[PDB]
Write a protein that binds this ligand. Structure first.
Ligand SMILES: NC(=O)c1ccc[n+]([C@@H]2O[C@H](COP(=O)([O-])OP(=O)(O)OC[C@H]3O[C@@H](n4cnc5c(N)ncnc54)[C@H](O)[C@@H]3O)[C@@H](O)[C@H]2O)c1
Ligand SMILES: NC(=O)c1ccc[n+]([C@@H]2O[C@H](COP(=O)([O-])OP(=O)(O)OC[C@H]3O[C@@H](n4cnc5c(N)ncnc54)[C@H](O)[C@@H]3O)[C@@H](O)[C@H]2O)c1
Ligand SMILES: Cc1cc(=O)oc2cc(Oc3ccc(Cl)cc3O)ccc12
Ligand SMILES: Cc1cc(=O)oc2cc(Oc3ccc(Cl)cc3O)ccc12
Lengths: 284, 287
């Protein structure tokens, strides 16, 4: 059978959940990587049934969640954790670095064949690029971009040949969006470029594919935290070629396709799933 | 149940067949629009079972083709057909083959459809480089390979349901230099990709109809062979040696991507150029 690890789920309002739902229609087994500071909250909500409606796929099936594990994209191996190891919210957790989660998944379930990067962070996202500190900019690149490379480096060993990987990006990398601050734009630019270079190395060495989905705006918790997202949604719904509301499951079905054998000849691409908004220059 | 019109199938060796095959696999009904110069040949081979093996999808599934119609994308309406073509040996027996007439025929026979495939190209001077292409040659390339998409859309939107989907096929020579891709074919593909955007805007807003284009890698189709003065053998060998994915690119690889874009699974995607080429487009320097 097929197993997908999804790194970057904090709740049911994001793209990670949508991707999980859609993969579920194809009977893919799902493992969630959850950022430790919100891990116990998530587990609490889940156990309390808060996500039950959200887990419903169709009349016949609910989402098959194989496992849920703490996962922090800041840390490559156990050797990289600063203190933090004993922070209030990290202390009762273990094995949450990228390599540790890879070893854990492999130990419990064997090899997987789908990998989803669905996470971003930037401590200074509220500042515009020109007022971003070095520390802030590098945090953004570290968490939003390098984490993709690191995820690939540790997970290829536990993947099958002809496996497939995706991440999520945003058009601010290619065209200016004021409000998308703190080096987030820069991080998505690196991410899209890295997707190509990784596609070369993964393709030639392992026959593994990798692509990125450039999504349109979604009112996820993180987006709301940057409002900017309300403007972006209102603007997209007024001016995109397609005026339907953009759903997380619209990204999910594209992700589902890029992660399956049906897209076997697609790699290294940035695929726009945004109701066509990226193609517009002058709003009518 | 889904119905797709595929414009530009002349045999089992091009991308059109690969697209048909992948669609039938998902139980989409398929209508072939076939250029009149090859129409009788195709029908005959079909009736004689020459395509039987190629129609084998897998171990216990075979393609079903709903219909096969003469179709010439050079002509918008019956009034556009010049006297010479109308009376030509290969056209004189055929009817309803203009873009307007085939849409009308399809609608009358089957009602509204929901998928449309543009899988054709033509260019009289493809063997010349751009600088040595005549005005007539260039405009022929644009007319046949690019305008034909606009016209197909203009007439087929009235016989398509909302939420329907359209695709065409392009090539990376539009965006980066491929010296042997002559005769204004490069220009035509540039225009096709740009028109795909503008059309996505008009069709999206007014019809809730989506349109995209697939930039395919090289395939040894009958038409690809006509390029050399081979060009396609070089392109294929180069692709298999240098792409991130080093495996033979198949027509059905394009076909399954086409199927995805034609389906509701891709409802938030429109106006896009999607590359299906084993990743070759992302390379700068061959290692
Ligand atoms: N919301 C949008 O409009 C939008 C648009 C385009 C792309 N995206 C991308 O989609 C992805 C998901 O974003 P979302 O909008 O669904 O937000 P989200 O809140 O659903 O998810 C982002 C997740 O990343 C997790 N995360 C943050 N730092 C982490 C770390 N250090 N280690 C592990 N996990 C960490 C968060 O807990 C959060 O759950 C992101 O890559 C984002 O850039 C979002
Ligand atoms: N073969 C490749 O390496 C390659 C690469 C990228 C893109 N493409 C594109 O894919 C599409 C299909 O090409 P192919 O290589 O599969 O060749 P093909 O020979 O299979 O298809 C071209 C078809 O178009 C038909 N045609 C030409 N002019 C027509 C007209 N006036 N009206 C109706 N039909 C007409 C021909 O009969 C032929 O069957 C074309 O758009 C081509 O540019 C091909
Ligand atoms: C700063 C930050 C933290 C986090 O956890 O997720 C994030 C997810 C983020 O996702 C986005 C939201 C809206 C848009 Cl339009 C694009 C996005 O990339 C951004 C920023 C963060
Ligand atoms: C001139 C011409 C006539 C025709 O019927 O089909 C064509 C199909 C063509 O398809 C291609 C083949 C190879 C490559 Cl690499 C790209 C293509 O666009 C080109 C040109 C023609």
């Amino acid at each position: 059978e097929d197993i997908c690890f999804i790194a970057g789920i904090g709740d049911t309002n994001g793209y990670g959940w949508g991707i999980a739902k859609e993969l579920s229609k194809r009977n893919v087994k799902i493992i969630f990587g959850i950022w430790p500071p919100v891990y116990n909250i998530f587990m609490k909500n889940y156990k309390n049934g808060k996500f039950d409606n959200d887990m419903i796929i169709d009349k016949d099936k609910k989402m098959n969640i194989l496992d849920m594990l703490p996962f922090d994209a800041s840390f490559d191996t156990a050797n990289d954790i600063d203190e933090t190891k004993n922070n209030k919210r990290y202390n009762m957790l273990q094995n949450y670095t990228i390599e540790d989660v890879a070893n854990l998944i492999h130990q419990k379930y064997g090899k997987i064949n789908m990998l989803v990067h669905s996470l971003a962070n930037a401590k200074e996202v509220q500042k515009d690029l020109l007022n971003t500190s070095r520390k802030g900019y590098l945090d953004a690149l570290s968490k939003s971009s390098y984490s993709l490379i690191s995820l690939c480096k540790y997970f290829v060993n536990i993947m099958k040949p002809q496996s497939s990987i995706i991440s999520l990006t945003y058009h601010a990398s290619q065209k200016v969006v004021p409000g998308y601050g703190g080096g987030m734009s820069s991080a998505k630019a690196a991410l899209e470029s890295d997707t190509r270079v990784l596609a070369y190395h993964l393709g030639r060495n392992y026959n593994i594919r990798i692509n990125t989905i450039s999504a349109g705006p979604l009112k996820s918790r993180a987006a709301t935290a940057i409002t900017f997202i309300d403007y972006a949604i209102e603007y997209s719904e007024k001016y995109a070629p397609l005026r339907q509301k953009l759903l997380s499951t619209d990204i999910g079905s594209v992700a589902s396709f890029l992660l399956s054998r049906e897209s076997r000849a697609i790699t290294g691409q940035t695929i726009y799933v945004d109701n066509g908004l990226n193609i517009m220059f002058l709003p009518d």
